[PDB]
RNA sequence: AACGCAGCGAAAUGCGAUAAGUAAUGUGAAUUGCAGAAUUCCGUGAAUCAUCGAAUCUU
RNA sequence: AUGAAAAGCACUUUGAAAAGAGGGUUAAAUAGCACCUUCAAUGAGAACUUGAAGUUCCAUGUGAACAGCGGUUGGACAUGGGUUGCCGGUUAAUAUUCCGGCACCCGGAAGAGCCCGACACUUCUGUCGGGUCAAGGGUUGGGCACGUUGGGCUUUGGGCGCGCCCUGGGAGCAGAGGGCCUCUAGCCGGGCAACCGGCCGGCGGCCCUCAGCACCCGGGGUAGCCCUUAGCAGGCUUCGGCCGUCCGGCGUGCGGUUAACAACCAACUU
């Protein structure tokens, strides 16, 4: 047994990720029992096991998040956490198409009388 | 704690399924034999005077019931 | 007068030789009751007169019984260490080595160590030592251990035998890779140098100082890199008292100004430790070794499990060190709680394995010497070391 | 040696105060390492810890004075400090006499010694402070009955 | 003189950035000049020192002392080479910290990444030369 | 032409309430079950009092999370150690953690459980 | 704002039961008071390093 | 804000300790992390510690500081531990919360607690016996006859025994004597030794004879209990008869005049 590398975790299905998470949590339990009155090399493993559990949970979480974004592709209403977060102001700001819209009369002026590329000699 | 005055009722109380245990208490200073049976809810005590009647009762109740003799100075 | 039946009772010849493993009572092998003396060395320089002193010779004769049973104990040690030197090899398990050593000792001394009082009459002086690689001392496999020695192990074998509370403690090291061989000679020289230096009125700091020149005068080639041999400063020899492996006086293996003298009638354990590392060891690993303290606090134990276990230790082991397996063989079922409570209270000290830094190699040799009134007797000397 | 913990523990186990616990001076060493209720309890059985008897406080003199008052030895005027009502209330004297007189009249009516008409007349006479005590009431009844007997015509 | 606007010529800011520099930055600060043999072999003037290579001391009370670095101790801006020690009162030997600027690297610790580091520095130096020599 | 009314009090008519049928979950995935058996049970307590409980009262003293109740403690020990309990008594220590005394069923011996379940070994 | 989290910490700093942090990218041998690791670089890669686009985020 | 770098002081010695004197590091230490009484015990030291006599909680330790004197002591310091509807018990520290029992005149209940004892006991551990119920007032006693209820006790008659003592079988166990064979130890003659002959200790498994304790099966006798009839288990006499000289109560004439008398029990108050 040893520290779990995050590289190999990314290539495992969900159910195998769940199985390894249970083993890691179980090992941390009994190893945390022995901590009373003992100083030495025993402690290093529980620190590694805690961080090992964290890596697995992120991998399970990340693979779950990626699947949800795939399912909710081409969907009008996405969940709140899957929706982009920039700031409150940027989300209420007008859409790019809306802020750049023009009227019929303004479009007619620009079509026939836009700003020209002119030069004046001396 | 409740008393059984009649003999016949006492065996039926000792016969019901929730009779966990029973004991015999001897009072030599008065010649009283106390038959106590413990059920789910109550402890039933039957006070006896004649030891001749006592011997008939001990072998009449169903054998499954555990009976003790209540020794003096029960250790903690 | 009644003439009763008297069937012929063939006088069995006493056995003259030992077996593999050793099971023959030692008294069978020495039918006259006299056991061999150890190595006898005259004191040096201003103490040479001691050899022929009439008054000191008679004084020694007052303790003839002390001398002769100890000589028995030393002879038992030599035969058991010969067997051990012939048996230990890569591929042997620690469990079977320990069981074989104890059975041989117990058979030879005639004490199964199951009945009350029996372990206090004679037998093991302390738990055997089976120390691998970086472990210098105080490692013993507990029940169920499955570890097998490998080619690259360095194993320390430390055997103690007592008779009537007089304990012979001697220890030696084996290795099988020739690059590890030089370590044994280095430590051997210091032990042998101690033998030359030991004596009445000798100052212990000089022994420690001499040890320093010899250890740093040796080096060993390991895997292409050279390491000087360093004394393990924080280990020391000791005096021996009845039924107690450690007395109050120490003989260091580094220089000091200590003005403690070796004295007539004393017994000393001359032990040396060498290391390729820092030269001091720390406690690390699973604990197997324990010993009741002579200066034991007389705390009124609050735990009943402890209340029993302590008496069992005193009755069966007294102040002699013991191990867990010595409890298992008595029939105590689950007892660690009382034992750990006793350790926590401080009545009974637990002796964890002692290790130098990871990747280093250590060697150990030990002898017991008796400081007799006329001469020094290195009683545990043999042809191996 | 500090035995303050031992004295507190002994008092709790002995079921007494801390001022009654006696610890043997000549065995302060064994008491010193008691440091538990069981060990303190063991030293009680071994006679090392003993509960002192209570200080003597006797009511013998109080009994002697009470007996002397029953015969009238310490009842003088100089021995009274309160009012006669505080010492012996008139309200309880009146209540005692009323019940005594009423109880006497009740059994006389039941036994037939007097009829209801004489009983009723005597009941209000008693309520009116006519008879000092029991003897006066019976003396009155005897005189009245004789006169009632006398009218034979 | 300083020209670029982003560069600061303030003593206070320079002292703060140097003493409070993180571990990655402290590696670049703790650089040592290569030996002339390696300087002409790799065309590299200096390298960030690393634990695992032999070093010669050129300044201090321990001049002309050769030994391999046992620890690159970045917190104190010092390194420890072998056999440079000082005895305490107890007689225990403690390593003496030497600044990487007072030493010269006579042998390198040859790793796969040090090849890239040396290749990057070398390729840059002649590349500059061709541009300047035009 | 209008329905009769037996009372002079007008009451709001009953109209149906449609259940919520959101077109998107406000939270993408439900949270993992918080405070499972590993989070609840932290470590047994090795102290003179706690060990005394094991030998005499057949009870095990544990240190659990301060925000767990007796129902969760009983379930945690059963699914993690396969040990049953007749009752559990919990207190919150002054340091801020929860101490749980768990009396085991009479069929099992707690002292063995400490050895087998590695409580103290 | 409160309460917790470090092998050994009380404060500060940092973090949130994934807790003195995780993932990903860059760089490329350390951290350091004592402990304790990793490549042994051919994938696999220290550190409270830098960056930081993925997550966790107790009351 | 020591010093470039902790190189921050090894070791010896005095002192209970703090520290001092040497010695050492440094370029520099003119840079040292301040850059009420008596006795006894404990202890370097006792008026204010202890025994006997007259989170502050708990345990262990303790240099400085504090406890306006001291301090070995502490609510101070250091490090551990402690907080889980009645009775009894349990802890160094929690209990109506833990454990056991039992619940929402008699049973509980004497088996509990409390006093006395005896023997053991290093401790793991106690074990077994005994007890522990002049005036001011009350309560009884009302009788004879008759009839009726409990019949308090006894005799006869009827029913149910097995308490003891006498007789048959067994079970388990204990000890003394004799027989079978197995292991270990001492003495004598012989024998190079091996081995062969005689005496002696521990044996020590099995069989036979004698003495003692506890248990089971089958046959005899009571000695105890329950029920009825008669007397109240009775005494006197004409010997017919009479008294009911048994206790307890209830109903009908009385008598109620000296119960205004006796006995018994009780506190206090001029």
TrEMBL record, chain A:
The name this protein goes by in its record: Dolichyl-diphosphooligosaccharide--protein glycosyltransferase subunit STT3
Native organism: Chaetomium thermophilum (strain DSM 1495 / CBS 144.50 / IMI 039719)
Family: Belongs to the STT3 family. Belongs to the universal ribosomal protein uL29 family.
Purpose of the protein: Catalytic subunit of the oligosaccharyl transferase (OST) complex that catalyzes the initial transfer of a defined glycan (Glc(3)Man(9)GlcNAc(2) in eukaryotes) from the lipid carrier dolichol-pyrophosphate to an asparagine residue within an Asn-X-Ser/Thr consensus motif in nascent polypeptide chains, the first step in protein N-glycosylation. N-glycosylation occurs cotranslationally and the complex associates with the Sec61 complex at the channel-forming translocon complex that mediates protein translocation across the endoplasmic reticulum (ER).
Subcellular location: Endoplasmic reticulum membrane
Top-level lineage group: Eukaryota
UniProtKB/TrEMBL annotation, chain B:
InterPro entries given in the database record: Ribosomal_eL38, Ribosomal_eL38_sf
Keyword hit for Transit peptide: no
Listed GO biological process terms: protein-RNA complex assembly; translation
GO molecular function annotation: structural constituent of ribosome
Residue numbers spanned by region Disordered: 59-76
Domain of life the protein comes from: Eukaryota
Keywords of this entry: Ribonucleoprotein, Ribosomal protein
GO CC annotation terms, alphabetical: cytosolic large ribosomal subunit
Similarity annotation: Belongs to the eukaryotic ribosomal protein eL38 family.
Descriptive protein name: 60S ribosomal protein L38-like protein
Organism of provenance: Chaetomium thermophilum (strain DSM 1495 / CBS 144.50 / IMI 039719)
Taxon lineage: Eukaryota, Fungi, Dikarya, Ascomycota, Pezizomycotina
UniProtKB/TrEMBL annotation, chain E:
Region Disordered: start-end pairs: 1-22
GO-annotated cellular components: large ribosomal subunit
GO function terms (MF aspect): RNA binding; structural constituent of ribosome
UniProt keyword annotation of Ribonucleoprotein present: yes
Family recorded in the similarity comment: Belongs to the universal ribosomal protein uL24 family.
Keyword Ribonucleoprotein carried by entry: yes
GO biological process per UniProt: translation
Organism annotation: Chaetomium thermophilum (strain DSM 1495 / CBS 144.50 / IMI 039719) (Thermochaetoides thermophila)
Keywords of this entry: Ribonucleoprotein, Ribosomal protein
Origin organism lineage: Eukaryota, Fungi, Dikarya, Ascomycota, Pezizomycotina
Name used for this protein in its record: 60S ribosomal protein L26-like protein
Every KOW domain range: 48-75
UniProtKB/TrEMBL annotation, chain F:
Extent of Basic residues compositional bias: 1-14
GO biological process terms on file: translation
Alphabetized UniProt keyword annotations: Ribonucleoprotein, Ribosomal protein, RNA-binding, rRNA-binding
Large ribosomal subunit protein uL23 N-terminal domain residues: 1-31
GO molecular function, one term: structural constituent of ribosome
Organism this protein belongs to: Chaetomium thermophilum (strain DSM 1495 / CBS 144.50 / IMI 039719)
Cellular-component GO terms for this entry: ribonucleoprotein complex; ribosome
Protein name as it appears in the record: 60S ribosomal protein L25-like protein
Family that this chain belongs to: Belongs to the universal ribosomal protein uL23 family.
